[PDB]
Design a protein around this ligand. Structure first.
Ligand SMILES: C/C=C(\C)[C@H](O)[C@H](C)/C=C(C)/C=C/C/C(C)=C/Cc1[nH]c(OC)c(OC)c(=O)c1C
Ligand code: SF4
Lengths: 427, 166, 180, 160, 353, 95, 117
């Protein structure tokens, strides 16, 4: 009954915002998100399905991740417009349905329900923010058209629009590719990533956090349902990781560089799609969501509009704990021992090798080695000379959130044998 | 095509235009109030066919020049005459429009025939509404070709047909 | 929308040009343009006899004209020291308030017609015609009557005048009360 | 069928060619309304009757009416302004335009299907229990989506 | 069309031509009779002139309409300016054959109606949208924004209350469960006069039909008395004739539909004569609407949109919900008699305060 | 089968538009053509596979209406003050 | 249901109506003096600029139309429940009522914020 919490609290707050103050609106949104998250925890191993709505380990874990990201990004946003929060709630539900169904058409409905509110969330009026909103909207509507044609060819291959169909020859491959088009577009896979640099630079930094965590989480959750062939997977991974890291080297701004880095990270994530392990991918995306939320909370505390690399430097002198947490996040996202990013990457690489894809894995790893250049040029900068730099050192709220994120990351890096046991049915 | 080239045809179209004459308002001065009184609920110009009143000039054939035509109003009315479709007639209502009337000065055109071809003249100050009805009955027999002047001449159906507008 | 609500259009009574600055359905501000009716009474009157100007006075406010006639008459009377007989002055105030009623009748007809329905223009206006009959009985003219004079009035009231007047003063109040 | 099938498909294709080719936006929009009317007629020919009528009512009656409303409020009829033409972008994209057909054509090429089912006409009398029923959960999700889109657009404009 | 027969195509074309020319002559003579009725209302009497009783003046009016220099305005669109009136007339003339004038064969053997589509109300809705289409299209093509804003008012108001039309037409279907007109009419034959069951929605339908060009939004708009409307102000010979023709066709189409759907479509409990009762109810609603034409003021289309949007349409959808409760639970139908009677007594007794 | 090839052709045409159209609204119209071509394919496969695609296409139309409303709001937001909706004047965000 | 023959009769209705309309247009066009004037083709109202120099018209109509597309989608969903209801029972009524209530909640939002704008 997590859907119950989401729908009820959202619809109620819709009207309640007229008589209730934005502070109360914030507290109520927090309570709704927290109650949905608690319900998700209490339903561990308790599948609850009505129609296309199907709650399994995938839906459970990934929507937990989305709820965590939503909670964090709501904690930080302080603008005097209540609306700027309600939409997030909406988005949450949509992304839930993205993981909680195999029904392609309901998948499309949830995809739209999640893509819309972020568009308005990217409207800080910032000239680059509005440019990002328009680019994102047009490309998303195109990707939705592609996903719809894929569901059409799916229905051509089978009498139902629910995934799991037997599948024909070229028709089923074409439908799968057309679905994969929109799904990877939302997953920042090349050659469908092009929105990501513009959007991550232009969108307000907290919205960038929320997107890069929840949208990608739910997108991969639904991706596990797809029957992705190895060859298309090989091409997507190759292009995604290559373009991501290589273009990331040339970036001088934090947000866009991190966007290309997220392209690379999604390329790494895509390995579980070889086997659909749904355990390796769950762990990977857990680590990535935590580290991303931490780093982007730092970026948001610095400046929502734009944060260059040089401004990031010297953060340790500014804030020691925050700089250490950002560095630890950079390392975990590099895929280094003994941090959980390495465990997620290893799990994905193992699923890939079990699938028998060799040269793709080799190229992915070489490109991951490339990534260390900028990952270090940013992570280590924490210690550099302080330049004049916007620094609003947050409330203890965001400090504790960052602390818990980093501790969870490192703990699961040393002891992945704790949560990784409970990503399957949930013993 | 101009309502000509058969004895039955032109008589019939003249019938149609004559009894279907639709006035186009041109309110200038106190002539306009007694113009209106030709429509009130003692005396309506609503029987001959002029009940409805299309204020738009693209939709009315009869133009009632009602009031003193001040000179700054001339091109406007000028354009209004050209901004009427070609089957158009112009009635000169009141003294101030037909002649300079008692306002014989720099400010008033001394005859609206200067800018637009006057079809019918009707003096009075103000002309009783029934006098306007008689003017339009005269115009009725005019567009039918049933009208003659004092010299014996049989007036043409439509004035503004003899002018090189420009 | 710098819109040109032109002279006489759209059916804007009192021919007048308006340059309405406006965005949408509000009305920001109207820049007027008048003079499309300038007749030049103030000049022509300097070239007509004092007796003759009483012909010029009503044709200006052609709704409430007799107030113009009376104002000019009073100014001249003061100027040369004339005496208005009390019966003559009484008849003058009668004509004044009667033209006032005619003005208000046409005013409400034009207003109610201007926005809303076309019906209310007729009924009151009928009474106006009736009122004119009264004038037609005394002045022999619909309006623009050349009746008043410096010393007084043109000529006498007909014997048939008062009964029509009493008939209208009895029927009118119930009419006005029903409209109210 | 084939007599009207070929003609209807030609009308559809020419309308699409116009709506993607015409630079007079109004002309493209009305060509597209012709497209949707012929499309609803074809829907009827496909025993799917309800959907065609809703297509005409919703898309034509409501949506592209709003398209025309915007482009008359915001002139925007002739897009040929502020070019930055990028000449090479015209053919290559156009080339890509053809390619996305062929593979789809390939996916449909060499395909035969069982077009024999007793639809009994696509009347909503039978569509209800699917809509309200198997699709009822999808229905509530779609309605919530519509409400969310309303609020998003409102807060998006929301001058204050 | 489960049980309703089909005439050959040539008879369908014959009746189609007859319905076109009948609506033509009908709106012409209705212009006449409305002029005379307005006159009867505004004391002033009508044309005992060129008629004699007036019934030949419209021919002179038509002969005036032709020869009136159908003008192609320069600096305005060559094509759409001409095109829009054709749209407004074509998509208006049709959708009148559906209105049943009698039981099958009561056209001396063949068909009272022309076509009896399974989805009739949807056909009416669709063809209603295209009238507004032509209206505001002509408003644009004129290239005089004076009329542009008027056509915009037209489209805004008519589309608002046309939305209300859907929530209005929802309610009866739950009771009927069929979308063929003749079935609903026979329903009102046996059970009796559906408005007795569904009074409130009828109002928001009537108001819609009064908002949809009858009168009193009066921001329809017509050029007179306001910022001039669309669909006129630039057409001379036949195109303005086409616009007026289509507007009056919509007038009589609604004036015929209102008795057709809610009240007793012809099908009277008494004497069951096919055509005369339907024509007479058409005339009745026409006279009431003309009474309103003469008797009520404007609505400014902003307060009008607020009124339709915040009050009418919520009422219609709520009434749909209540009728849905009754139908899905299906226990009584007398509940509906009681409920609508209460509703009408509410909307009536609330006046004399 | 002609219906499905027609859906493919109409989708290709809508893509031709989205690539070609300079103005946001004409792009949006091309997208509408794309979605309706997809819905035509859905109706064909529903006639084949049993009528489910009808409700599918209905939901598609609803979703399209929602995203169209929001996209029109955004388009107004950017090019109410700004000049022609042409996207080429939006290039600040670069790699 | 209904036989397809009635729909072809509908198409014939439309075809004859269209042909007659185009004929009426031709009648209107052929019968005329046909003496255009440069001022006759002028837009309106005294020289130029009836409206002329004006900026874009209000968005209120856009708001109404966007509202209308969404709410007509609503009514499109509500009609299938309008036809087949008793067979859908309390389950169908409950689904349709929750649907209408969600969309009317959105409407209540737009109302309490209001669009006079
Ligand atoms: C349904 C309604 C219709 C079909 C028509 O609109 C109605 C029948 C037409 C009418 C009433 C005529 C209008 C003419 C007019 C507006 C003249 C200008 C004018 N009008 C005045 O008001 C009377 C004046 O007095 C202050 C003036 O000085 C002046 C110069
Ligand atoms: S002729 Fe007399 S009534 Fe007419 S405008 Fe002149 S002064 Fe007025």
């Amino acid at each position: 009954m997590t859907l119950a919490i989401l729908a009820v609290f959202s619809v109620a707050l819709t009207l309640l915002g007229f008589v209730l103050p934005p502070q109360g609106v914030k507290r109520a949104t927090l309570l709704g998100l927290a109650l949905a998250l608690a319900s998700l925890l209490l339903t561990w191993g308790k599948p609850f399905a009505f129609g296309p709505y199907a709650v399994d380990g995938v839906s459970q874990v990934f929507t937990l991740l989305a709820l965590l990201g939503a909670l964090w990004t709501v904690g930080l946003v302080r603008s005097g417009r209540f609306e700027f929060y309600l939409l997030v709630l909406y988005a949450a539900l949509g992304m839930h349905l993205l993981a909680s169904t195999r029904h392609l058409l309901l998948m499309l409905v949830a995809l739209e329900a999640l893509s819309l509110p972020l568009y308005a969330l990217a409207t800080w009026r910032r000239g680059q923010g509005l440019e990002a909103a328009l680019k994102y909207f047009l490309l998303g509507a195109l990707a939705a058209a592609f996903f719809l044609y894929g569901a059409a060819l799916f229905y051509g291959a089978t009498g139902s629009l629910v995934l799991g169909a037997p599948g024909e020859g070229p028709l089923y491959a074409l439908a799968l590719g057309l679905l994969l088009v929109g799904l990877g577009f939302k997953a920042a896979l090349a050659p469908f990533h092009f929105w990501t640099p513009d959007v991550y630079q232009g969108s307000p930094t907290p919205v960038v956090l929320f997107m890069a965590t929840s949208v990608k989480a739910a997108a991969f959750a639904a991706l596990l349902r797809v029957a992705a062939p190895p060859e298309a997977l090989a091409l997507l991974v190759a292009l995604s990781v290559v373009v991501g890291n290589l273009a990331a080297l040339a970036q001088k701004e934090a947000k866009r560089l991190l966007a290309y880095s997220s392209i690379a990270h999604a390329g790494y994530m895509a390995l579980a799609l070889y086997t659909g392990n749904a355990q390796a991918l769950g762990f990977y995306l857990l680590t990535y969501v935590l580290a991303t939320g931490l780093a982007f909370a730092v970026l948001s505390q610095i400046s929502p509009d734009r944060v260059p690399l040089e401004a990031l430097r010297g953060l340790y002198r500014k804030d020691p704990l925050l700089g250490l947490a950002f560095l630890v996040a950079m390392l975990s996202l590099l895929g280094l021992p003994p941090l959980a990013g390495f465990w997620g990457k290893y799990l994905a690489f193992a699923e890939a090798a079990r699938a028998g894809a060799w040269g793709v894995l080799v190229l992915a790893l070489v490109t991951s080695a490339v990534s260390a250049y900028y990952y270090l040029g940013l992570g280590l900068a924490v210690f550099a000379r302080p330049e004049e730099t916007p620094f609003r050192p947050g409330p203890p709220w965001a400090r504790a959130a960052v602390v818990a994120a980093g501790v969870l990351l490192l703990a699961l890096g040393l002891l992945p044998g704790l949560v990784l046991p409970a990503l399957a049915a949930g013993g | 095509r101009e309502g000509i080239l058969f004895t039955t045809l032109e008589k019939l179209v003249a019938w149609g235009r004559s009894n279907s004459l639709w006035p186009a308002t041109f309110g200038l001065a106190c002539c306009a109030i007694e113009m209106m009184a030709s429509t009130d609920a003692r005396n309506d110009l609503a029987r001959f066919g002029s009940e409805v009143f299309r204020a738009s000039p693209r939709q009315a054939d009869v133009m009632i020049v009602a009031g003193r035509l001040s000179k700054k109003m001339a091109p406007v009315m000028r354009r209004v005459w050209e901004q009427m479709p070609d089957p158009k007639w112009v009635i000169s209502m009141g003294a101030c429009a037909s002649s300079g009337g008692m306002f014989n000065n720099y400010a008033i055109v001394q005859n609206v025939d200067s800018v637009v071809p006057v079809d019918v003249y009707v003096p009075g100050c103000p002309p009783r509404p029934e006098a306007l009805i008689y003017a339009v009955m005269q115009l009725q027999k005019k567009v039918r070709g049933q009208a003659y002047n004092e010299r014996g001449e049989r007036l043409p159906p439509v004035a503004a047909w003899k002018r090189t507008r420009g | 929308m710098t819109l040109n609500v032109g002279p006489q259009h759209p059916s804007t009574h009192g021919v007048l040009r308006l340059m309405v600055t406006l965005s949408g359905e509000e009305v920001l501000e109207v820049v007027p343009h008048i003079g499309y009716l300038h007749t030049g009474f103030e000049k022509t009157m300097e070239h007509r006899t004092y007796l003759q100007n009483i012909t010029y006075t009503p044709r200006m406010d052609y709704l409430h004209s007799f107030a113009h006639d009376l104002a000019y008459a009073l100014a001249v009377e003061k100027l040369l020291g004339a005496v208005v007989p009390p019966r003559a002055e009484t008849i003058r105030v009668i004509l004044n308030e009667l033209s006032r009623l005619a003005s208000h009748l046409v005013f409400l007809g034009t207003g109610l017609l201007d926005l809303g329905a076309l019906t209310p223009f007729f009924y009151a206006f009928r009474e106006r015609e009736t009122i004119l009959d009264l004038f037609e009985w005394v002045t022999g003219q619909r309006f623009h009557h050349n009746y008043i004079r410096i010393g007084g009035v043109k000529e006498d009231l007909p014997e048939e005048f008062v009964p029509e007047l009493k008939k209208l003063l009895e029927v009118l109040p119930h009419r006005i009360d029903e409209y109210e | 069928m084939s007599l009207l099938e070929g003609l209807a498909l030609f009308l559809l294709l020419l309308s699409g060619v116009l709506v993607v080719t015409l630079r007079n936006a109004i002309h493209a929009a009305l060509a597209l309304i012709l497209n949707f009317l012929v499309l609803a007629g074809v829907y009827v020919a496909l025993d799917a009757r309800f959907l065609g009528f809703i297509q005409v009512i919703v898309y034509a009656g409501a949506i592209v009416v709003l398209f025309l409303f915007v482009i008359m409020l915001l002139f925007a009829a002739q897009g040929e302004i502020g070019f930055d033409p990028l000449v090479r972008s015209r053919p290559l994209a156009a080339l890509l335009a053809l390619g996305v057909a062929g593979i789809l054509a390939a996916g449909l090429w060499g395909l035969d299907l069982a077009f024999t089912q007793d639809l009994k006409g696509g009347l909503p009398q039978a569509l209800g229990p699917l809509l309200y029923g198997d699709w009822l959960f999808v229905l509530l999700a779609v309605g919530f989506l519509l409400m969310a889109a309303t609020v998003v657009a409102v807060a998006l404009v929301e001058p204050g | 069309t489960w049980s309703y027969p089909v005439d050959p195509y040539w008879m369908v074309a014959l009746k189609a031509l007859l319905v076109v020319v009948g609506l033509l002559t009908a709106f012409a003579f209705m212009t006449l009779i409305e002029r005379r009725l307005l006159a009867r209302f505004q004391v002033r009497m009508g044309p005992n002139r060129v008629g004699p009783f007036g019934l030949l003046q419209p021919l002179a009016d038509a002969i005036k309409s032709i020869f009136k220099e159908d003008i192609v305005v320069a600096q305005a669109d060559r094509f759409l300016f001409v095109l829009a009136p054709l749209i407004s007339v074509v998509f208006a003339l049709l959708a009148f054959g559906l209105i049943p004038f009698g039981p099958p064969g009561s056209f001396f053997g063949y068909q009272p109606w022309v076509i009896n589509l399974d989805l009739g109300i949807l056909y009416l809705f669709a063809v209603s949208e295209l009238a507004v289409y032509g209206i505001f299209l002509s408003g644009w093509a004129s290239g005089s924004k004076y009329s542009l804003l008027g056509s915009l008012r037209s489209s805004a108001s008519l589309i608002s209350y046309e939305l209300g039309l859907g929530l209005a037409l929802l309610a009866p279907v739950l009771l009927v469960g069929s979308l063929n007109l003749n079935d609903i009419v026979n329903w009102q034959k046996e059970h009796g006069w559906l408005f007795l069951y569904a009074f409130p929605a009828f109002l928001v339908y009537l108001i819609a039909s009064m908002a949809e060009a009858a009168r009193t939004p009066f921001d329809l708009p017509e050029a007179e008395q306001e910022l001039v409307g669309g669909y006129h102000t630039e057409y001379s010979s036949i195109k303005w004739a086409l616009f007026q023709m289509a507007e009056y066709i919509h007038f009589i189409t609604a004036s015929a539909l209102i008795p057709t759907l809610f009240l007793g479509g012809w099908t009277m409990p008494v004497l069951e004569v096919p055509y005369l009762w339907m024509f007479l109810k058409i005339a009745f609603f026409l006279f009431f609407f003309i009474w309103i034409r003469a008797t009520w003021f404007r609505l400014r289309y902003d307060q009008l949109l607020r009124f339709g949007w915040g009050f009418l349409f919520p009422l219609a959808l709520l009434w749909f919900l209540v009728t849905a409760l009754v139908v899905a639970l299906d226990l009584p139908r007398t509940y509906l008699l009681y409920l609508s009677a209460l509703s009408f007594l509410v909307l009536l007794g609330a006046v004399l305060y | 089968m002609s219906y499905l090839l027609t859906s493919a052709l109409l989708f290709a045409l809508g893509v031709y538009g989205v690539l070609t159209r300079r103005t946001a609204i004409l792009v949006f119209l091309s997208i509408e053509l794309m979605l309706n071509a997809a819905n035509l394919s859905l109706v064909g496969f529903a006639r084949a596979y049993g009528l489910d695609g009808q409700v599918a296409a209905l939901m598609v139309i609803a979703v399209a209406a929602a995203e169209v409303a929001v996209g029109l709001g955004l388009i107004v937001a950017i090019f109410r003050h700004r000049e022609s909706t042409a996207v080429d004047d939006l290039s600040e965000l670069r790699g | 249901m209904a036989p397809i023959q009635e729909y072809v009769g509908t198409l014939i209705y439309v075809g004859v109506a269209l042909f007659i309309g185009v004929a009426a247009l031709l009648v209107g066009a052929l019968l005329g003096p046909k003496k255009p004037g440069r001022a006759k083709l002028m837009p309106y109202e005294s020289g130029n600029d009836p409206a002329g120099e004006v900026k874009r018209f209000p968005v209120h109509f856009y708001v109404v139309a966007m509202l209308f597309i969404l709410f007509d989608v609503e009514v499109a969903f509500l009609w299938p429940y309008a036809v087949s209801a008793g067979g859908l029972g309390l389950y169908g009524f409950l689904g349709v009522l929750a649907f209408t209530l969600l969309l009317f909640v959105g409407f209540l939002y737009e109302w309490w914020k209001g669009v006079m704008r």
